Design a protein around this ligand. Structure first.
Ligand SMILES: Cc1nc(CN2CCC(CN)CC2)cs1
Length: 460
């Protein structure tokens, strides 16, 4: 049986509004309803991995797992295996996989982050799961961020606390947060960003939704505008939204949005909004294609509608040569030429690099770079041709061209990372000097850039 080079992944997010689900929720897993929906001809074809995020989930883990497994069994006639389940308060993530994948999946991690302090600590935060699927690392985050139209900045803060403190993936990747630890990272949930239009315009917004005219609403969606201004989710993707706002509905129908202020809402308006979202970030030049992104129309127990997204995701096999794992393949090398980092920092420490990659036996520390002043104020750290030649464990080009090098630029004084980025080895040529580039981030914010040339030697 050949190892796959592509899998499909289902992502669901549903704020259940503290209510039990209805008896049938199959439309969710079938990507049926509004938006970018899945073809009927695919209904019986199981996805490889199903990742279900709930918020305001009133069920026990056992109760929800029985519902999910029953649902998938009905659709696919396959009995899925539980990879992981993790709950923080009423925020939950379940990962299910086809049984043929059970011995492809390893290094399963779970974690949670509680957001806020005192007043604001006790119900918002995130849960996450990571694992390896053969040679590919996969990470999944379900977050329930702060509510309320006038709290976008708090949501942005919640995002940065989650990506800083969620401890998933390979702990040896110490300089890297979750936004660099995975080949594919999916981040979804009740992100709680709202359509920022005046309260007076509620009925106008409703009219627009009934006409399926979302353009003038999406131009005011706080998540799209904050992302465009680089305030949140830097270097993440989201499919175009083509489904109606998923919040706030009257329960037991989808005919009415319940937007007016009530004691139950703390006297806050809930104008129709796209609270419920799926975003992703994959390493450069890895295959990832969104094949559905929408909301169900027939699941009406909550004041939110479920959201689905599905993806094709490239995966690689667990490579064994005669040499690596457990020795180098002298036929292989990575040379970083004429490299320099441009940093936004005002500090004047010396810097060194660390190169991390599962194609290396362990991470590689460079010598300190040479600091110069950029013409527009910046720090430029030059490494010249001084950088250590990296010796991958396997030289086979079918393996090496699919790998990535994580780079951290660290202060000599403090050993703290000032910036993190990633370089693909999916080059246009081997044994050839080629330009490379990554932005550098720290705590998910832009801190600089790294650029130069690479020369990759494989066994071919
Ligand atoms: C929130 C926004 N980000 C962009 C830039 N990105 C647009 C898509 C592109 C991938 N084809 C990567 C860069 C414009 S608005």
């Amino acid at each position: 049986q050949p190892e796959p080079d592509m899998i499909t992944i289902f992502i669901g997010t549903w704020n259940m509004g503290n209510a039990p689900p209805p008896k049938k929720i199959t439309s969710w897993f079938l990507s049926k309803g509004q938006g970018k929906t899945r073809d009927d001809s695919a209904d019986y074809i199981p996805h490889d991995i199903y990742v279900i995020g709930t918020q305001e989930d009133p069920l026990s883990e056992k109760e929800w797992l029985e519902i999910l497994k029953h649902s998938l069994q009905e659709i696919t006639s396959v009995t899925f295996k539980t990879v992981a389940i993790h709950t923080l308060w009423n925020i939950r993530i379940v990962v299910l996989a086809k049984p043929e994948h059970e011995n492809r999946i390893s290094h399963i991690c779970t974690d949670n982050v509680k957001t806020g302090i005192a007043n604001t600590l006790g119900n918002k935060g995130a849960v996450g799961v990571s694992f390896m699927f053969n040679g590919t690392s996969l990470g999944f985050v379900n977050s329930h961020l702060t509510s309320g139209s006038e709290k976008k900045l708090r949501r942005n803060q919640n995002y940065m606390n989650i990506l800083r403190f969620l401890a998933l993936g390979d702990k040896k990747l110490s300089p890297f947060n979750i936004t660099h630890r995975f080949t594919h990272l999916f981040w979804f949930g009740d992100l709680n960003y709202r359509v920022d239009l005046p309260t007076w315009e509620a009925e106008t917004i409703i009219q627009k939704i009934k006409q399926q005219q979302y353009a003038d609403l999406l131009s005011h969606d706080q998540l799209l505008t904050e992302r465009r201004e680089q305030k949140v989710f830097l270097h993440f993707e989201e499919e175009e939204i083509t489904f109606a706002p998923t919040y706030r509905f009257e329960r037991l129908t989808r005919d009415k949005y319940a937007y007016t202020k009530q004691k139950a809402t703390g006297m806050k308006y809930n104008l129709p909004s796209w609270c419920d979202r799926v975003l992703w970030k994959s390493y450069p030049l890895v295959h990832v294609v969104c094949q559905s992104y929408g909301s169900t129309s027939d699941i009406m127990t909550s004041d939110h509608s479920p959201v689905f997204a599905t993806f094709e995701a490239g995966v690689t096999s667990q490579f064994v040569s005669k040499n690596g794992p457990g020795t180098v393949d002298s036929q292989g090398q990575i040379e970083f030429l004429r490299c320099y980092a441009t940093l936004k920092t005002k500090s004047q420490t010396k810097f060194y690099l660390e190169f991390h990659s599962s194609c290396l036996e362990s991470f590689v520390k460079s010598q300190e770079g040479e600091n110069e002043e950029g013409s527009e104020g910046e720090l430029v750290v030059k490494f010249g041709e001084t950088l250590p030649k990296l010796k991958p464990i396997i030289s086979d080009p079918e393996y090496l061209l699919d790998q990535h090098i994580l780079i951290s630029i660290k202060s000599s004084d403090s050993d703290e990372s000032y910036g993190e980025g990633c370089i693909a080895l999916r080059l246009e040529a081997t044994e050839t000097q080629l330009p490379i580039y990554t932005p550098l981030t720290h705590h998910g914010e832009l801190t600089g850039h790294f650029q130069g040339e690479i020369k990759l030697q494989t066994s071919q």
